[PDB]
Structures are given as structure tokens and as C-alpha cells.
Motif scaffolding. Structure first.
Motif, short mmCIF file in Angstrom:
data_model
loop_
_atom_site.label_atom_id
_atom_site.label_comp_id
_atom_site.label_asym_id
_atom_site.label_seq_id
_atom_site.Cartn_x
_atom_site.Cartn_y
_atom_site.Cartn_z
N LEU A 169 0.79 -1.23 0.00
CA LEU A 169 0.00 0.00 0.00
C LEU A 169 0.83 1.30 0.00
CD1 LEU A 169 -2.63 -1.14 2.61
CD2 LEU A 169 -2.82 -1.17 0.04
N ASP A 187 1.51 -2.33 4.74
CA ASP A 187 1.72 -0.88 4.80
C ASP A 187 2.77 -0.59 5.87
OD1 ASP A 187 -0.15 2.03 5.81
OD2 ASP A 187 1.13 1.82 4.03
N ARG A 219 -11.03 -0.74 -0.05
CA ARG A 219 -11.51 -0.10 1.16
C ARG A 219 -11.48 -1.09 2.30
NH1 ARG A 219 -16.33 0.68 4.19
NH2 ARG A 219 -17.54 -0.58 2.67
N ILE A 268 -10.94 3.35 5.38
CA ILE A 268 -9.85 3.89 4.56
C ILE A 268 -9.97 3.36 3.13
CG2 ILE A 268 -7.35 3.96 4.20
CD1 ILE A 268 -7.03 3.65 7.25
N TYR A 307 -8.20 3.25 -0.71
CA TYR A 307 -7.15 3.46 -1.71
C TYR A 307 -7.82 3.45 -3.09
CZ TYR A 307 -3.68 2.59 1.85
OH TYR A 307 -2.85 2.71 2.94
N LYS A 320 -4.90 7.71 -1.01
CA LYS A 320 -5.41 7.10 0.21
C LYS A 320 -6.23 8.17 0.93
CE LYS A 320 -3.98 7.82 4.12
NZ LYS A 320 -2.94 7.06 4.83
N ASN A 376 -8.74 8.59 4.41
CA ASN A 376 -9.40 8.14 5.64
C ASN A 376 -10.54 9.11 5.82
OD1 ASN A 376 -10.23 7.91 8.43
ND2 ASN A 376 -8.26 6.94 8.93
#
Ligand SMILES: [Zn+2]
Length: 357
Positions: free
Chosen positions: A8, A34, A81, A89, A91, A142, A144
Motif C-alpha cells: 500500500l 503498509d 476499502r 480507509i 485506496y 489514500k 481516511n
């Protein structure tokens, strides 16, 4: 066998597409990494839901419940997600360099009003470090969403009175689930973003299937095209009246009066209203006259609005639990918790308690 993984810190469209396109009917273990963070998820193709966006096919993928992970894949974009520390979150990766740059600028822009040093936890452009040349253009973003609202000090949108009540109109589990089209119509003059729209559709579909084993009864098929209709004012109620009238008035829609219809836009309506629907307007036995219609925002920051309005269409009232999808205030939760609502929705789709879950 080394387990497939998605990094990620460098995740691109081609990363997501290559991994997701390799998922067979028996599913695939994929490690999400990540830096120090690592999560093994079991991914499967979602065979319940079909989506076309302007005839572009979009496929959904699911983790296990314990994985808390969803994916979306089109030819043009992909989304991962998942939840970390109880926060959603996403991406978001577009295939084409110019579109990805455009999307990154679009999501970055609101954060240039006000800057925090924790900004990276809310929003980050992701660059490909594998290109040791030093990638100039981002390969994904990304976001959030829970953190993002806190930085942005958004004007808080809501439902208020987001449904309108209308007059009311052997049986077994069907041999095949009934296909129900959810015909989403891009409002005249609206720009909607493919990742945003498909996320709303996924959350709407999954909110239904989570109730009383409803995939036995229905498979939802979402399609998106553009309508000539636009709301005549900022008022949601007036907008919905006009939208349903637009469907009935259109000779092109003759014979599809028994499907479900949403007018979609990116923005909201007067009083920061997120959507609106006709309550208890869809039943698999009696659906008719474009009654099963509503309107929904599709913006990223309000996940689950389409789910909530589809809830109302299927008969769900506002629920008392703040963690319920159908709570009267927008709280971002994506599942029905009310047993009364679950029973109403399921009955309207052909279920009865003797069938079990
Ligand atoms: Zn509502």
C-alpha cells in the motif's frame, strides 16, 4: 507458494487489477502491507451484484467478515476499502495517468484550505517507489474518510425528513434469485466519479444481502446512464416529485416501470440533505409505475447514503440505534440492525420466516 501481496506504500491500478484478476471462484489469500502493518485477507469475487457504469463493467470483491475489506475493479479504476482502528480507509487508483492526476487534484483540493501535520493520516498521494527514477505522478490516493471530516471541518449534511409515505398497493424461495435492476441516472449537469458511485452501489447491495440471506431472493444489477432531468430547485421533495414524473413521462422507459430508480448527483440538496426516497415503494410482486424511486448523493465523504435510501424504498423506517444504517441522523454505518426493518425489507423481496436465513 509465496502469498500474493499488495504494497500500500506504492499501490497502483496495475497492482490491484493484476491481483484481483487472478482471484478464482475458490478465492485467494492476499496480504495487505503498509510498512509495519500487515493483514492477510481472503478475497472472493462477488457474484451477487452486477454493475455497469455507462456500459463499463465493474466487478466487486469481498473479504471475509473478519477481514473488513472490499474491492472494486473496472477497466478505468480500482478501489480497496478496509478498516483500521474502526475507521474506513479507501485506496483509489485510476489506470490512466491523466485521469489519476485529475482525481488526485480533486481529492487534494479541499485540504489546501487548511493544513494539519497529521494530514497524511487523512489524505495522501501515493507514489511508486519501485520506479527508482522517482515517479512524478501519483499512482493512487489514500483517504481516511473519518479522519478527513475532522480536518476539513465540513458543513455536516444530514437526512432530516428524507422519505415520503405513499398509499399501500405458492410462495417459496425462488429457484434462482430475481434480478432487480437499480437504474441510476446521472442528473443533467452532474459530474459523478466512477469510484464514488460504485462504492455507494456496493454498500447498498451489501446492506441488502446482509439481511435474512436475501441473496437467495434477489441479485441487484446496477446500471448508470445520464438523464435529461435536473431538479428544478434546491428542494429534495420537489426534486423527487419531478424525477418520478420524468420517468413516467419518458416513452423510452415504458415497460421498465417495475425496477428501482435513483437520481444521482455529487452534491446535496437544500438544508444539506443527502437524499430522499418514496417509502415502502418496492415489492417484488407488485412493483409498478416507477414508484420505487429516490435520489442520492454519491460523494465519498458520505458513504452509505444510497444504502439508506434503498432501505427506505424497501420499507425500512428510521431506527433508534445510532449504529444503524437507518438512524435518522447520518452516522456512516452501513448495515441494518433493526429487526423490524429487516423483516419489512425481506418480506418485500419475497422472504418469510419459515424460509430461515
Ligand atoms: Zn432516512
Amino acid at each position: 507458494p509465496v502469498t500474493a501481496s499488495i504494497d500500500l506504500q506504492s499501490v497502483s491500478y496495475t497492482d490491484l487489477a493484476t491481483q484481483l484478476n487472478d482471484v478464482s471462484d475458490f478465492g485467494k489469500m492476499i496480504i495487505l502491507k503498509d510498512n509495519g502493518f500487515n493483514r492477510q485477507v481472503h478475497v472472493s469475487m462477488d457474484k451477487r451484484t452486477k454493475i455497469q457504469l455507462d456500459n463499463e463493467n465493474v466487478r466487486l470483491f469481498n473479504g471475509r467478515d473478519k477481514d473488513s475489506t472490499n474491492f472494486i475493479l473496472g477497466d478505468e479504476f480500482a478501489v480497496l476499502r478496509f478498516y483500521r482502528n474502526g475507521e474506513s480507509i479507501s485506496y483509489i487508483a485510476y489506470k490512466e495517468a491523466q485521469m489519476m492526476n485529475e482525481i488526485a487534484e480533486f481529492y487534494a483540493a479541499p485540504f489546501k484550505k487548511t493544513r494539519a501535520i497529521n494530514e497524511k493520516e487523512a489524505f495522501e498521494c501515493i507514489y511508486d517507489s519501485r520506479t527508482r527514477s522517482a515517479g512524478k505522478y501519483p499512482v493512487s490516493v489514500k483517504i481516511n474518510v473519518d479522519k478527513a471530516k475532522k480536518i476539513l471541518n465540513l458543513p455536516e449534511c444530514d437526512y432530516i425528513n428524507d422519505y415520503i409515505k405513499t398509499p399501500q398497493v405458492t410462495r417459496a424461495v425462488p429457484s434462482e434469485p430475481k434480478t432487480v435492476y437499480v437504474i441510476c441516472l446521472r442528473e443533467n449537469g452532474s459530474t459523478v466519479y466512477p469510484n464514488e458511485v460504485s462504492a455507494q452501489m456496493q454498500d447498498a447491495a451489501n446492506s441488502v444481502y446482509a439481511v435474512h440471506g436475501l441473496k437467495r431472493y434477489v441479485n441487484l444489477h446496477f446500471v448508470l446512464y445520464t438523464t435529461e432531468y435536473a431538479c428544478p430547485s434546491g428542494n429534495a421533495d420537489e426534486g423527487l416529485d419531478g424525477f418520478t414524473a420524468s420517468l413516467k413521462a419518458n416513452p423510452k422507459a415504458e415497460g421498465y416501470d417495475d425496477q428501482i430508480y435513483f437520481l444521482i448527483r455529487w452534491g446535496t440538496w437544500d438544508n444539506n440533505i443527502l437524499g430522499i426516497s418514496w417509502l415502502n415503494s418496492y415489492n417484488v410482486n407488485t412493483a409498478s409505475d416507477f414508484k420505487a424511486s429516490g435520489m442520492s448523493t454519491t460523494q465519498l465523504m458520505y458513504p452509505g447514503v444510497m444504502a439508506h435510501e434503498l432501505g427506505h424504498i424497501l420499507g425500512a423506517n428510521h431506527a433508534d440505534d445510532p449504529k444503524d444504517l437507518m438512524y435518522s441522523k447520518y452516522t456512516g454505518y452501513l448495515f441494518h440492525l433493526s429487526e423490524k426493518n429487516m423483516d419489512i425489507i425481506a418480506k418485500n423481496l419475497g422472504w418469510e420466516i419459515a424460509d430461515g436465513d
